[PDB]
Amino acid sequence: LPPGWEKAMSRSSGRVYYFNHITNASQWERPSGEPARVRCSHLLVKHSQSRRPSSWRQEKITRTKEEALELINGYIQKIKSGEEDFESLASQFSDCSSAKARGDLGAFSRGQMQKPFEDASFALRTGEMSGPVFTDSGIHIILRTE
Ligand SMILES: CN(Cc1ccccc1)C(=O)c1[nH]c(-c2cccc(Cl)c2)nc1C(=O)O
């Protein structure tokens, strides 16, 4: 399987799935299928222990980390169900200023982002979306666009 991917058994179904411990992605289908540069967008939910608990959305961000994680989980569910798209949730709900660009961060190489974000970004394939990624900024959903 590609970097970070592992096989596991589901609790509810007994069906096998695949989990990525770098990106926190999980899916039923197998992935079997490194560039200098990637381009991603993201959706950031900040919390009380974020390095900077404020944003364009809220002067003082007070939600707990577990609360942020619950929000992130809700957004992932809507993106995966097709009920909302990534860009629209990012513009609306992301605590990053990149919310104004539908979450787009532009292209970047290794050495630039906080490491858990960088690693998750480089482990995604074009088109692929991460699970909840924790950094000192808060919790991220990352979509690799290029
Ligand atoms: C930069 N920062 C404060 C901080 C300072 C030092 C270390 C970590 C976070 C943030 O909270 C922040 N971090 C990010 C961000 C954007 C892209 C990727 C990552 Cl890992 C963080 N956006 C913001 C923002 O406020 O818009």
CATH number at 62 reads: 3.10.50.40
**Domain span at 8:** 1-32
**Both 117 and 142 in a single domain?**
yes
**Both 4 and 61 in a single domain?**
no
Which atom belonging to ligand 1 lies closest to the Cα atom of 117? 20
CATH number at residue 14: 2.20.70.10
Full strand arrangement of the beta sheet holding 5-9: 5-9, 16-20, 26-27
Task: Give residues with Cβ within 8 angstroms of 11, minimum separation 6.
Answer: none
Ligand 1: which of 96, 117, 124, 134 to mutate, most ligand atoms within 8 Å of CB?
Answer: 96
52: Cβ below 6 Å to ligand 1? yes
104: Cβ below 6 Å to ligand 1? no
Nearest to 24 by CA among 131, 128, 110: 131
**Both 18 and 61 in a single domain?**
no
**Both 41 and 62 in a single domain?**
yes
Q: What is the distance in angstroms between the CA of the first residue and the CA of the last residue of the chain?
A: 21
Say how many Å lie between the CA of residue 3 and the centre of ligand 1: 26
**Both 53 and 81 in a single domain?**
yes
Q: Whose CA is nearest to atom 18 of ligand 1?
A: 113
**Both 76 and 138 in a single domain?**
yes
Torsion of CA 120, 75, 57, 134, to 10 degrees: -30
Give the tokens for residue 12. Answer: 């509810």
Resolution in A: 2.0
Query: ∠ at Cα 95 (103, 78), nearest 5°?
Result: 65
**Both 27 and 44 in a single domain?**
no
How many domains are contained in the chain?
2
**Both 48 and 102 in a single domain?**
yes
Specify which residues 55 forms β-bridges with. Answer: 58
Which atom belonging to ligand 1 lies closest to the Cα atom of 97? 26
Specify which residues 106 forms β-bridges with. Answer: 40
Contacts 24+ apart (CB under 8 A), 87-93: 87/41, 89/43, 90/41, 90/42, 90/43, 93/43, 93/45, 93/57
Q: Which whole-number Å values give the CA distances from 56 to 33, 48, 98, 135, in the listed order?
A: 38, 15, 10, 19
**Both 24 and 41 in a single domain?**
no
Determined by X-ray
